[PDB]
């Protein structure tokens with residue numbers, strides 16, 4: 001018949017068998033994650049073997065149906081997903097070598113130690129030893145030997161592997177009609193959907209650059225406030241108009257500035273709002289936390305949790321001797337089976353992560369109506385943005401008062417509110433230049449615009465100019481400091497952390513305007529707005545069945561990234577920061593080095 | 598009449614090879630059926646559920662099978678979908694009652710129950726009350742299959758997977774379709 005008639009029939013066979021094999025892998029992996037067992041490791045790996053094998057043959061078959069021969073977009077979108085397969089095109093010897101490199105990098109990253117020059121008996125792994133330093137130490141020299149040792153022990157080992165990684169990954173990518181490996185990664189944002197919902201892979205760079213330009217003023221002022229407060233701790237080594245030295249940033253890479261809060265808090269005489277104590281005095285348990293998250297989604301008109309959700313989840317660490325993995329996850333096991341795995345504790349943190357993880361489950365439930373292959377977030381950024389805005393609402397003092405964890409007469413001081421926004425910014429605004437600059441480097445390396453003889457030269461040029469961060473020690477081309485971060489050594493794209501941050505405030509602002517919340521965006525709670533819930537469901541139910549541009553338009557009214565909601569969220573902190581900075585320099589010189597003398 | 602060997606039967610049929618039992622020459626008590634509240638679906642077509650207990654009919658057919666909870670909507674006149682089109686079809690002029698109940702406790706196993714099947718492909722839609730039990734390879738394109746699976750050549754049956762942890766829409770439902778014929782024969 002038609003190519004399209006055959007594709008539909010092909011997809012129908014795929015869907016029915018894929019839903020079996022995918023479900024059995026989910027079930028087997030759930031058994032392992034809720035009972036770590038050498039047997040459950042076997043059952044898990046075999047279920048993933050059957051599922052991987054089938055999925056691979058089926059991607060090959062999908063290529064027999066040329067997309068140009070296919071009218072229906074829903075059929076087209078499913079085939080498109082199937083026939084982006086990977087390094088299958090790569091020769092067997094090159095494919096075997098790429099995997100060798102990939103595993104070697106991951107293993108020297110996960111096992112490398114760094115020894116104290118002061119005590120050779122003290123050789124720490126990143127976790128827990130070096131992370132403890134980089135997140136807690138206020139001693140310039142301690143942080144420095146941790147920071148430099150890591151980038152020299154493991155980073156130097158990674159250097160020649162990463163050169164071969166780029167060459168091979170690029171070879172695979174070009175043999176798949178992609179310009180380079182970076183252009184392949186930008187594939188996740190491509191949209192060839194209806195009307196003016198189309199989006200090219202090259203547009204992503206343009207949109208990440210236009211939006212970043214709009215964020216830099218806010219960042220520059222956050223950067224100058226933090227620089228001034230770090231002068232009070234490292235007077236010898238902080239220049240009032242220079243970049244910040246890279247090892248003083250509160251983690252190994254400066255990826256987040258969250259751990260600079262004790263050094264930089266605006267009003268250290270004010271405590272954080274922390275309803276943990278109220279939860280213990282009201283005798284909350286894990287069941288009460290998830291019951292309250294459930295009430296929240298029902299208040300905006302979304303479904304309850306399923307009965308199997310309550311019966312089959314693991315909302316509490318087991319005490320039957322079963323060893324489990326405690327990291328919080330939300331599971332869409334297939335065939336109507338939705339679960340959460342969490343070692344829930346009676347704290348404000350775990351109360352907020354439960355709303356976050358239940359947000360994932362709500363997205364999963366909404367797009368279960370879609371065909372198997374379209375059962376996902378509109379793009380790689382959507383799922384977390386959705387989970388995150390549930391946290392934003394659940395944490396607001398308005399919501400905590402309605403829930404009863406805050407007294408009905410509670411009033412937030414302007415100082416407490418500035419304290420809170422500043423902590424938000426150290427995490428949310430602080431990572432935006434880091435994230436953009438990292439992926440911009442990788443994009444340019446894959447593109448061949450940064451030759452290997454200039455890799456570390458350009459890495460630190462862009463870290464100085466874009467991030468305002470300067471290396472404490474010069475680093476020649478024996479180094480490979482980008483690979484010294486987990487995601488780079490383990491072959492994960494990074495731009496998702498940038499885009500989801502922008503989406504999340506676009507989502508939150510559009511729902512808050514729908515709920516007709518008046519006042520500052522950062523105080524908004526969408527609870528009890530069924531209008532807001534409907535607008536939300538308009539997007540969630542689509543899954544990946546439409547261009548992400550249209551999915552975005554359904555909830556926020558525009559079809560692209562816009563940073564104004566992010567800036568609106570932080571506008572109180574912004575005008576405060578400008579006042580604080582009025583007698584200091586704002587911006588930074590790209591020439592001063594901590595080692596220039 | 599012996600509604601108890603169909604309804605409370607131990608084993609049920611896959612939807613594609615659905616079972617049929619003739620009920621005739623029979624003292625017919627329909628109150629016991631609509632008095633049991635285990636049934637999740639009890640839609641009647643033509644006849645009224647209570648008013649059914651006082652009507653007399655020429656013969657009664659009791660078709661029984663197992664499907665997924667999501668598909669119980671298809672066992673109704675005027676429906677489309679894989680079940681209504683390829684497995685069990687009700688006439689637009691149907692007179693009778695569709696009775697369904699969740700059977701997760703019986704029909705779903707840990708690790709999965711794959712014994713219940715449904716037909717995935719067919720060259721055309723079933724006629725009302727047709728029963729296709731063939732297993733010829735479905736030939737989707739011009740190239741022939743020669744009795745073996747291959748490119749564009751699919752085995753036409755497919756298993757349900759019934760694990761007890763499935764959501765309600767994916768849980769096994771036992772269905773009984775009661776067909777009442779009124780004219781062109783004497784009553785029974």
Ligand SMILES: *[C@@H]1O[C@H](CO)[C@@H](O)[C@H](O)[C@H]1NC(C)=O
Nearest residue numbers: 600601602604605629630633
């Ligand atoms: C079996 O089902 C019938 C419904 O026709 C019911 O009357 C009977 O009570 C059931 N069996 C037993 C042992 O109760």
Ligand SMILES: [Zn+2]
Nearest residue numbers: 356360384387
């Ligand atoms: Zn999440």
